[PDB]
Design a binder for these strands. Sequence first.
RNA 1: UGACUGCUCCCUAGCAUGCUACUACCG
RNA 2: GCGGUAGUAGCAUGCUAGGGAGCAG
Lengths: 187, 187, 103, 103, 78
Amino acid sequence: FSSLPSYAAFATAQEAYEQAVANGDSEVVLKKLKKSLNVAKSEFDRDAAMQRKLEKMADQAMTQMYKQARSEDKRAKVTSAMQTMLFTMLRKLDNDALNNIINNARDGCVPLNIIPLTTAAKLMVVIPDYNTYKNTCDGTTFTYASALWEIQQVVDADSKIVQLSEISMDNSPNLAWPLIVTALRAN
Amino acid sequence: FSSLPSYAAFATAQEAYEQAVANGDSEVVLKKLKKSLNVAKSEFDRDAAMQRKLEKMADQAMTQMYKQARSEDKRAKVTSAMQTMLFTMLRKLDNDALNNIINNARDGCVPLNIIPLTTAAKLMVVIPDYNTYKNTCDGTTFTYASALWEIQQVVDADSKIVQLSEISMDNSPNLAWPLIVTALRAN
Amino acid sequence: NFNVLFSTVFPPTSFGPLVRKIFVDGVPFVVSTGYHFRELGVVHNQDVNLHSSRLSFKELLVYAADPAMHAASGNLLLDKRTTCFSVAALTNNVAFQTVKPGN
Amino acid sequence: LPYPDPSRILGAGCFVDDIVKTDGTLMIERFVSLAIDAYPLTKHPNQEYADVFHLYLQYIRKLHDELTGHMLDMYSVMLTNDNTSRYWEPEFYEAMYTPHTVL
Amino acid sequence: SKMSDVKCTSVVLLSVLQQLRVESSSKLWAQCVQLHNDILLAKDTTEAFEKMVSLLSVLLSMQGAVDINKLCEEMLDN
RNA sequence: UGACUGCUCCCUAGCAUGCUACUACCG
RNA sequence: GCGGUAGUAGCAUGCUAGGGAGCAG
């Protein structure tokens, strides 16, 4: 309140009225002793009820503008994370076996369900039981999707390496059974 | 209440306006005094309501604090507590099978698998000492989990097939006593 | 109603997004530019550009959400636990998720 | 009036998700929102159903004597029971099933 | 009574067994979840006290993990 | 790891209205 | 003697936001 431009009048009117109490004041000067700090006090309160509103308004943009900054800084951290993805899932397209089906296409459009089926290098087979295993993945090589795949690893549900000799007809009760066979393309 | 700095105004003015009717005076003096009582009374019924709100407010922040500190000691001690809960609850059930496999597995006779409920139901426990064997099983009969099993094979530490006739507080000090007894359920 | 009946005659690998190769600043992307519905037939997108330079925010949200790039960079999958058609395996391991008891 | 299955309201106070209701004093609002649902069981002709509501009003008081008595023996704090007694009286919950909506 | 005290001790027995990382052997966690889901659906206190021996024996066959002696001399069953 | 909607109780901060006393100028 | 005007404190209502929790499909 030490810089409000209505402190001078209030201060002076207080001094004139209050400080001059000991001195004999007649009933005519008493009006000046009374109706001089009055009105001035009203105006000061008016000069303080507007300052309090300007302060709050001000401290509602120095908070709503930190939030406009925060979000743009964030908008630049996700815009650079999707970019770092769509350029890492691209360096992975064996562009000899992929430009060989987009080319044999009538216009260059192909179904998406035949891209991993004809242009992939690895196969993952998930097998529930032993009966399913001998009709799908018997031996070290097997044919699927008009191709030939050679087994490379057989992990299990626990993710521990199984060998192709632990898989018997009677040792089967001793394996975590969802078995995951990883195979590579041949030729 | 008391002890508030603004309290020596609702005491002097309260005492004055008070005594003022016995001695008495003009209506002017009475009005003057009342317009000092109310002028320095609002100052009391304002500084003893703000406090009235701070005194209860304080006792809330210092209660959320008590909750954020008991709920972090209730979560950091989960392990130690649920094991105590379980054994306080296992004593109250007063079962017979449950109170056997617990006493047996405190002196040493723990199992090596799940206790099966079928009729073949092979079992494997580890008798640590001769007294535990003498109390539990006599002959070819074994009592465990309030059920009777028939011993089908006894095995010392490595693969030492003990015959039931040579384990008798005698030949007994000469072996590796953590045995692995195999049995099958009865009926 | 007729497409519903006539779509049971055709191979199940012909239904789904129709992809094509586009170029965004000299690199080949595979994106979806249509669809083949068992009921509504063949639908083709109206605003597809083959040669672009810069991707905005509204053009990265439509390229990350599409299954065209996730299922063209993952491994083939043959899942015998289910009888539903299976497309691809996005990683090298299969995730098994359980449910805990109550308190 | 609608009323629930008693085994659903009883079994919702016994089984939860840790720190939730493995300590009732840290959340007494869970049991005021479960006694609102159990209120119309007080009118049931079966007296084993009408007891599920009086059991929830007796536990909310237990959880309040403890709370205002656990912060007096470890921290010299004294809570005032003014405007807390409404949650173990059967008139805060009776007003949720009467017309002339409030709040 | 007695069927509600067994149904609450098998909820605390599969939480002790879930905090000991028995979830990392999916050939034994698949039996413990079947002995706990079966006790909760039981309708006799003679065929739920025998799946509580199989389920409890999983904890007493896990050696070092739980100190049985300390936990039984802790103002409990002696 | 934690979807879309709807209802509802409790606590805190801000805005306007409604009967009063206090101020002060003005009638 | 009364009315209007501008601040200040105090008690309830409705609405707009944030936070925690409960139920239903």
